[PDB]
Amino acid sequence: QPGTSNETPEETYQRAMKDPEVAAIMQDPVMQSILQQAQQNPAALQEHMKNPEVFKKIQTLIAAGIIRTGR
Incomplete structure (x- = not known):
C-alpha cells in the first residue's frame, strides 16, 4: 500500500530528487x-565525512534517505 509505504527505497529517491541539494x-x-x-x-568513508566539501554532500543524501549509513 503506497499510503503505508516504507520498504520502497524508490519512493525515498523521488522525494530527494525534489531537493535541489540532492540533485547537485x-x-x-x-x-x-x-x-x-x-x-x-x-x-575511507570516515575521512570523507570529516572533509567539509564531502561532509555536506554525504549528509544531504543521508537525510534524504537515499543512502543507508546505519549498522
Whole structure:
C-alpha cells in the first residue's frame, strides 16, 4: 500500500530528487568514489565525512534517505 509505504527505497529517491541539494550532489562522482573506498576500508568513508566539501554532500543524501549509513 503506497499510503503505508516504507520498504520502497524508490519512493525515498523521488522525494530527494525534489531537493535541489540532492540533485547537485548525486550528479557529483565524488560520492561514488567514497562508497567504493569504504568497501576497501571502513576508514575511507570516515575521512570523507570529516572533509567539509564531502561532509555536506554525504549528509544531504543521508537525510534524504537515499543512502543507508546505519549498522
